[PDB]
């Protein structure tokens, strides 16, 4: 299925912080905070210089891992993004960011992207008044992304929206904290997303 398994670890293979976890990825526990080397017997030993493949590969993985997502779903989007009029490097991220699983997390309903996928799949999410539970559903602009009237009372739902007390939400989005609704306004331009990815390397990895 999607990847379940140990995560603060990919956090470590990519050598940067992926925020795959959640409340502690922010605390002095992400093991990036404690063991910034990669996992395994050998992560202590000095690295060999990467091959071009290596760097192209890893930059792909870093980006993909950030977003959850299977390679088959990933490659299929990069494919779709190339068929688009646009700058595919950017068009891609816009497409990624359009995922319900993601929109929800960015909205601040879920602590993390992983937790977000459940919130979706277990039916806790409204899209335009109706239920949606495919984490892959594509949110278009004008879409309203709410919490189910039912699931309004969850600890994490309420506990997370109380962090919204002092966060502010992405510039292409609008949150209705009290009403527990968010609206998807436009696609995020490249400059809005501030990921630690060199999208261009991803493109290059796929043109082999």
């Amino acid at each position: 299925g999607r990847y379940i398994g140990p995560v603060c670890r990919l956090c470590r293979r990519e050598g940067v912080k992926l925020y795959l976890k959640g409340e502690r990825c922010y605390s002095p526990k992400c093991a990036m905070e404690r063991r910034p080397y990669p996992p395994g017997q050998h992560g202590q030993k000095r690295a060999r210089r990467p091959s071009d493949y290596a760097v192209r590969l890893r930059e792909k993985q870093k980006l993909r891992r950030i977003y959850g997502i299977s390679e088959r779903q990933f490659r299929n989007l990069f494919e779709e993004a190339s068929k688009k009029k646009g700058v595919t490097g950017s068009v891609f991220l816009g497409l990624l960011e359009s995922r319900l699983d993601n929109v929800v997390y960015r909205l601040g309903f879920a602590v993390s992207r992983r937790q977000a996928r459940q919130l979706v799949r277990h039916g806790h999410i409204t899209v335009n008044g109706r239920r949606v539970d495919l984490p892959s559903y594509r949110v278009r602009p004008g879409d309203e992304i709410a919490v189910a009237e039912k699931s309004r009372n969850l600890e994490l739902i309420r506990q997370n929206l109380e962090a919204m007390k002092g966060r502010k939400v992405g510039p292409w989005l609008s949150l209705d904290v009290e009403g527990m609704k968010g609206k998807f306004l436009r696609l995020p331009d490249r400059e809005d997303l501030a990921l630690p990815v060199n999208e261009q390397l991803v493109i290059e990895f796929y043109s082999r």
């Binding site: 071009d52 646009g86 700058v87 490097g89 950017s90 068009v91 261009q200 493109i203 290059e204």
Partner: protein, 157 residues
Amino acid sequence: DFEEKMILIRRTARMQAGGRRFRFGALVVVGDRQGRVGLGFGKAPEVPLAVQKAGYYARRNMVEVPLQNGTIPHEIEVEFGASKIVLKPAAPGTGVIAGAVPRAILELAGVTDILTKELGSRNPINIAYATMEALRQLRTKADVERLRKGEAHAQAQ
């Protein structure tokens, strides 16, 4: 103060009665990712020493690539010995779609989008040189206009 890259490192043999005797060769690129790149091939008897050498040479052999918005001003094809490179400029978000060598050279030039094929001999060193020579040769509806009008330029501009 540029980035350096390793195109390739090799070992090579002489001969003396009683043994092979070795020497090392390093192919090094040097760029500032905004239109200046130099290539150096240095040999010394020790590998890191060769690279030092190589790096020195690279900076003396420098070429100003006229980058036009991440890409090169027109297409171009250049032979060097057996080896031959073709550089077709490309649109945004295309990437350096180029082989092992040319990439390194192009990347450090400051190029981001470009099409490529190697052809003929694939030999690193000559492909290295063919590429550097290709870039040494690019011009601009600007560079070109001055060559052709030239002999009375500044009457129309």
